[PDB]
């Protein structure tokens, strides 16, 4: 899984950034069973004032988490994962849930490469 994580610059110290990546990665490993190192967390920082809720410019306190996932998981499991992510990030990032957005997109594992290797192959 890859998690693009969109955040403002000077908002997450280079530490709660570790706390958050570990939050995401540990929820994922523990709900899905995917081995730790298969879980990538990629932070996309942008200057504050680059997010707009309703066409209103916001401060720097928004976290969007966009997970790119393989198919096969269930509404239920993915619901547990999104909630667990909102929460652990809430703490790790010492930010409140209402600032966290979480979107999962799914993809056939045939079209996902990790470590240069395919997850599922035509074979």
Interacting residues toward Cl ion by CB under 5 A:
1, 69-70
Kindly list the distances between the CA atom of residue 109 and the CA atoms of 37, 54, 60, 66, 118, in Å, as whole numbers in the listed order. Answer: 17, 35, 34, 17, 8
Picking from 14, 36, 19, the residue whose alpha carbon sits closest to that of residue 93 is: 19
Q: What is the spatial distance between Cα 99 and Cα 25, in angstroms, rounded to a whole number?
A: 20
- Asked if 13 touches a copy of itself (CB under 8 A), the answer is no
Half-sphere exposure at residue 53, Cβ-oriented, CA atoms within 13 angstroms: 11
**Among 16, 31, 50, 59, contact with a copy of itself (rule: CB under 8 A):** 50
Does residue 11 bind a copy of itself (CB under 8 A)?
no
Annotated binding-site positions for (R)-lactate = 28, 70, 73, 114
Write out the residues near a copy of itself by the rule CB under 8 A.
2, 4, 6, 14, 17-18, 21-22, 24-26, 36-47, 49-57, 62, 64, 66, 68, 75-76, 78-79, 82-83, 86, 90, 96-108, 110-118, 121-122
């Amino acid at each position: 899984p890859v998690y693009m994580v969109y955040v403002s610059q000077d908002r997450l110290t280079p530490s709660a950034k570790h706390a958050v990546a570990k939050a995401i990665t540990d929820a994922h490993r523990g709900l899905t069973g995917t081995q730790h190192f298969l879980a990538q967390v990629n932070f996309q920082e942008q200057p504050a004032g680059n997010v707009f809720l309703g066409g209103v410019q916001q401060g720097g306190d928004t976290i969007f988490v966009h997970g790119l996932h393989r198919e096969g998981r269930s509404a239920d499991l993915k619901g547990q994962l999104a909630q667990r992510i909102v929460d652990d990030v809430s703490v790790a990032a010492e930010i409140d849930r209402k600032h966290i957005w979480v979107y999962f997109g799914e993809m056939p594992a045939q079209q996902m490469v990790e470590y240069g290797r395919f997850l599922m192959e035509p074979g």
